[PDB]
Amino acid sequence: MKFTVEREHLLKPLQQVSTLPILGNLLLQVADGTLSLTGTDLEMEMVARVALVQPHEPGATTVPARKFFDICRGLPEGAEIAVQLEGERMLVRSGRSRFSLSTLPAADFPNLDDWQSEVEFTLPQATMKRLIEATQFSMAHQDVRYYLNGMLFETEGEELRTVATDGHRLAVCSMPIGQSLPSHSVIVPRKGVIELMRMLDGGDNPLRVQIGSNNIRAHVGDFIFTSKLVDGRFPDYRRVLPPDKHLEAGCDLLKQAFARAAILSNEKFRGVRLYVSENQLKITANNPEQEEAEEILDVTYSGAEMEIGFNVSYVLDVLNALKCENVRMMLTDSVSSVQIEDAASQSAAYVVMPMR
């Protein structure tokens, strides 16, 4: 293996690709006038392809990922990196700098088995960014019910839909894509969702998605991302989408009143009390040291008077996730869920279960 490339052409791929020893290495392969850079943790794989303008020789090796990336990043702006193999070591040369790294054989590098895609669709990067960002915060954190620790990706009609829940709260976001799709549902793990997002730069290139039975592939520009899916069955979220009581209030005003009441609520339990009546909302919080907060707001409400309890972290997370002017809250009773939504969009819905 031999290649010379401009540092600026290596930097975004090296970023984008970075317990057993070889898992800490990058698989470097020169073939067909292209250099492929591959990273893996055994659950997921990232592959980057770089064009080779300058003279090169075919072959392959593995090198320490962070050491190789650091060297390239540490080199001056506009530097040319010459890479060669000399026995059991990799030689990196630029300017008057020389580096000799220890290798592991390319043959020993884990190669994920070939799988078959059942569903395929293209979508803009912005459509994928919205779907993940609208629901991600609702995923459970290290729950025994492993299936709640990821995200549901559902295709139905001409829409793609993301769902996330931790048993107490739920986030659902649906987006039209303009392709007739089969009804399919998959759970993408927490780590795959972080990577799906991390690969979105926010440019012109569309995202090409392929879903298998136990795998998901995402293509964008010259990068390929692959993840194993969560082997479980996601709960019946449709059964929990509710209503005779509807509240309308400004998003910022509401977000700021809940954030002030939050200070004086129980540090572990975060319970706030909501009092709804004729065009008014009263939020109250108490804690074990008997401290007390009270906030009163003008809202648009005309139904029956009601007292409902909520965990204030759950309410605020829903409101930080809504970048809008007005919010609609949909209630029924004190022991049933509230549905929170942007008053001008039905693309995303948030369902929070109350507390006694």
């Binding site: 048993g167 107490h168 709960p235 019946d236 869920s337 109350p354 507390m355």
Partner: peptide, 5 residues
């Protein structure tokens, strides 16, 4: 806390 499932 309630309790969706």
């Amino acid at each position: 806390q309630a309790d969706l499932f």
